[PDB]
């Protein structure tokens, strides 16, 4: 769904 992960942005799939 096109999500922008910017620098330093922790991102969790679960």
């Amino acid at each position, epitope marked *: *769904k*096109r*999500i*922008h*992960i*910017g*620098p*330093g*942005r*922790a*991102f*969790y*799939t*679960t």
Partner: antibody
Amino acid sequence: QVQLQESGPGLVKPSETLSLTCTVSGGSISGFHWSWIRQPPGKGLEYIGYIYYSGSTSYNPSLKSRVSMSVDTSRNQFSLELSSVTAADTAVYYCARDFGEYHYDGRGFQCEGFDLWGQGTLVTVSS
Amino acid sequence: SVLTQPPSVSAAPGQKVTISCSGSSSNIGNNMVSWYQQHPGTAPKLLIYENSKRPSGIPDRFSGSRSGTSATLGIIGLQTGDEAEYYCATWDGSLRTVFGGGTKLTVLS
């Protein structure tokens, strides 16, 4: 505040395996994709691949038959293993933290850049 | 290589310059560009991300833009300290991050 530090052998015999580790401090592996990028002396930069904190990976097709990466969240470290090395693999290796675009279809994570970089470690493939 | 940049650019101190990054539909056309500054002997440093965003610490005289399948790094008010190798990068459909060959910026002295 987050700092990355490479740890490598320095010299490696051709045909043998190159093993590197990156230690993340002042932060954690959790929630990020991590990569290794190398630069032969005087030449350009080459992305090797990325690994998500959970273990999923994606490697540069040009190195897929020789590379693998792993992660150890308990030590906040991730590693690189490059087999059958030759002089073409002589270069400064950097570990880095990634950012980019994530798709919920199949493209998954698309690494567009690196915001945090280790200081780099020179790996020389020679007898 | 997938991304192409002119090998070198130069201008006098106080002047401004631009650095091209030529890509294609498989990379810049679908993904955002990031730029780096590298002083020989040290690691690349993130200058621009998401085509035009500047991280904290990078002065506003550094800018980035993207159009079609190409991108541009602009540097205003050149200072001797700006001399370094500049690289553009992004994700390519071949399933990997690709870097341009790098542009050497010389501040004419």
